[PDB]
């Protein structure tokens, strides 16, 4: 189909056109069109968005509170996001999600875990919290093991993380209905945490 479809420089392909039969080659390498290499280099140089107002008091309460206490005083924190992320597949996915595939919850949970795996160092880092992360990386470098933040970080910063993702969501070229779905599951998250006030 069409009139111009060639992996090499196009010669109105619909094999090297305009040449004899003793020049064919069908080996496999990388392919680039480049418009016949800029038309043989111009013929050899001419022949040479915000969260809804439902439970917004939490970040107001925690903005003043992290100035001197930072919401945590024990480095091996007993609160981990692993169980509260695992409970989503057993509590809200079996009740609120429409019958079908739970990919929109499980895949998003795995993506949130992957984002939390490397989100440290660039964002969500108060100054003394940065010092605490520095001392955690110092004490975790004595056995040349990777720093895994699933066992030393609480779930209290997850609310701030879903507060600070939407303005960097629109920082890249992205379709609007993906952001609509993002804010939809953010609304689902705040619906789930509306009555579960003990863990946060």
């Amino acid at each position: 189909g069409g009139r111009c479809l060639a992996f090499h420089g196009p010669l109105m392909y619909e094999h090297y056109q305009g040449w004899k039969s003793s020049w064919d080659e069908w080996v496999g390498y990388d392919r680039i069109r480049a418009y016949n290499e800029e038309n043989i280099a111009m013929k050899k140089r001419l022949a040479n968005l915000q969260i809804p107002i439902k439970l917004k008091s939490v970040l107001v309460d925690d903005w003043e509170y992290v100035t001197k206490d930072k919401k945590i005083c024990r480095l091996p924190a007993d609160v981990t996001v692993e169980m509260v992320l695992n409970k989503y597949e057993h509590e809200v996915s079996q009740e609120l999600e429409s019958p079908g595939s739970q990919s929109q919850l499980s895949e998003y949970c795995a993506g949130l875990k992957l984002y939390f795996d490397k989100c440290l160092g660039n964002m969500l880092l108060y100054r003394l919290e940065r010092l605490q992360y520095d001392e955690l990386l110092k004490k975790s470098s004595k056995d040349q093991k990777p720093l895994v933040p699933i066992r030393i970080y609480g779930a209290i910063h997850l609310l701030r993380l879903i507060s600070v993702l939407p303005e960097l969501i629109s920082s890249t070229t992205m379709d609007l209905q993906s952001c609509q779905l993002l804010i939809k599951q953010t609304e689902d998250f705040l619906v789930w945490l509306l009555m579960h006030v003990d863990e946060y």
């Binding site: 915000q50 969260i51 917004k56 970040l59 107001v60 903005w63 992290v66 597949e89 996915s93 079996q94 999600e97 019958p99 079908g100 595939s101 739970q102 990919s103 499980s106 895949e107 998003y108 795995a110 993506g111 992957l114 984002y115 490397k118 440290l120 160092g121 660039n122 964002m123 880092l125 108060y126 100054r127 940065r130 010092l131 520095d134 990386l137 110092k138 470098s141 507060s163 960097l168 969501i169 920082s171 890249t172 070229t173 992205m174 993906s178 779905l181 993002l182």
Partner: protein, 126 residues
């Protein structure tokens, strides 16, 4: 001098390529200072991509062929070094082969969980 990632003054720290002022006790990369040289992440991607190589070609175009278990947000993962970090703030308004087996197993588990939620809904309907 100043700190773009601290919104303060602090001490003075300089860089060989793209010299910017930051805190000496808090390095811009996540690697702790507790060094012989310091290289910022914006300095890194610049000297790596933004100088003369693959400006038109998207590096993140072929990043999906090896990454698994993240699909919704992938363009923002590429430019994780192009933007410098900053201190805490808040606006006043608010105040493929193994991957094929992996996705096949995920679809298998999702089909079984669909069977379980079908059983749950016909149990709760009756």
């Amino acid at each position: 001098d100043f700190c773009s990632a601290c919104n303060q003054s602090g001490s003075f720290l300089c860089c060989d390529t793209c010299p910017k002022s930051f805190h000496f006790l808090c390095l811009d990369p996540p690697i702790d200072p507790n060094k012989g040289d310091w290289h910022c992440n914006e300095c890194k991607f610049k000297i790596f991509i933004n100088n003369s190589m693959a400006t038109l070609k998207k590096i993140e175009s072929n990043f999906i062929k090896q990454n698994n278990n993240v699909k919704i947000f992938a363009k923002l993962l590429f430019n994780i070094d192009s933007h410098n970090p900053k201190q805490f703030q808040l606006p006043n308004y608010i105040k493929t082969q193994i991957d094929e087996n992996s996705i096949k197993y995920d679809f298998f588990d999702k089909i079984y969980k669909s069977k379980m939620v079908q059983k749950r809904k016909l149990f709760q309907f009756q």
